[PDB]
Structure 1
Amino acid sequence: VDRILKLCQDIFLVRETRELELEEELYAKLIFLYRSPETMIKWTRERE
């Protein structure tokens, strides 16, 4: 889940820095990621 958890920690960070448009464009990336199940498997692998 690391590539989602990084996105959410950055959503908290920009939420604390007040750069609002990257709040709502990381929220945009999150909503799109969850909405399409197929792009979750292309995005939640592991590395080696």
Structure 2
Amino acid sequence: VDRILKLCQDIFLVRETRELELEEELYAKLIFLYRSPETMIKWTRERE
């Protein structure tokens, strides 16, 4: 879950860095990630 945690941390960072558009795009990405289980499997795979 390192990638999802990183995504959440980037959302939190951009929330305070004021680049609000980046927050909107990241939230849309997270919603889509939780909307399709196949992309969830792809992102939750373990790398080298």
Displacement over 3 Å in runs of 4+: none
Q: Once the 2 structures are TM-superposed, how far is the Cα of residue 46 of structure 1 from its aligned partner?
A: 1.2
Aligned residues: 48
Q: What is the aligned-residue RMSD (CA, Å)? A: 0.7
TM-score normalised to structure 2 length: 0.93
Instruction: Give unpaired runs (5+ residues) of structure 2.
Output: none
Larger % of helix: which? 2
* TM-score, normalising length: structure 1: 0.93
Q: What fraction of aligned residue pairs are identical, expressed as a percent?
A: 100
Q: Which runs of 5+ in 1 are unaligned?
A: none
